[PDB]
Design a protein around this ligand. Sequence first.
Ligand SMILES: Nc1ncc(OCC2CCCC2)cn1
Ligand SMILES: [Mg+2]
Ligand SMILES: [Zn+2]
Length: 313
Amino acid sequence: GLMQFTLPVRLCKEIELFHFDIGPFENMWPGIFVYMVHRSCGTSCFELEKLCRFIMSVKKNYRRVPYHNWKHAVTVAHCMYAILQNNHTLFTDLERKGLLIACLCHDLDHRGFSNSYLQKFDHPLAALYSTSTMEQHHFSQTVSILQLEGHNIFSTLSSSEYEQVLEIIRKAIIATDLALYFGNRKQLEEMYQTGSLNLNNQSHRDRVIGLMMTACDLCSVTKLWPVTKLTANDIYAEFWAEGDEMKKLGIQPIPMMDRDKKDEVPQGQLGFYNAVAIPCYTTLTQILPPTEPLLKACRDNLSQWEKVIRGEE
Ligand SMILES: Nc1ncc(OCC2CCCC2)cn1
Ligand SMILES: [Mg+2]
Ligand SMILES: [Zn+2]
């Protein structure tokens, strides 16, 4: 285990920043993830042969969809890495191990369709899992890959630590269901403001990890404008495909998913930053002050979308 991963100078420096873009070279993404695990967790956290086999099976189980693909998995993992590196002492050994794996696995086998579309289509997964449909599926796929021979990266954990890490991963992946975020953020807002937020309270830790998962999952809105703007195209490529599939079931989709209403995109992003993103990063900055650069970048991107609307770009 004297084999370190190193990145070229520009990446070695920029990877520490919240707004890092992992770049268009797919073959560098595994090495970027291993680099992050080594610095975030330690060079001993995982057996490298097992980790590499885990990563390549996870990659194979992401689909070639415009947005919810392998690049998203690694991008979301990198956002978690930056949060963990700016909040060193706040998180246990198992949490750091668990959360980067949770982020890598959080959208496993995504087909580019919302929980709503599965329900309206009457997909088998909607019968198996009544709520957080895709998210229970992502966690199921995680456990499946973990159970493949030579893929159990948690092998050296005790039985109790193993149940703990798999519970961190399960709660973290379920928390990426945006329908759960609204209630979770509201509850964290109340607890921070009334002064009852207690990081020794496991149910409180769970909620804070939940908000971090939402924060990492939405992190396209916290990049530099050229990345945010170009990621928005991939996000909308999926929304519009889903809108088309709604129209095939004889259902008018919400306007955000209707490709006849592309003109309304900039105003839809405004609503989304105001309703979801800004509140998310505001509450996260309150609980974890060193994540402030995410809120700042989100506010900058909101300002850029206001400029699109005024015809200034
Ligand atoms: N930039 C961005 N990122 C995520 C978004 O999700 C939109 C939700 C509303 C219904 C579908 C999910 C939107 N815009
Ligand atoms: Mg998801
Ligand atoms: Zn995601």
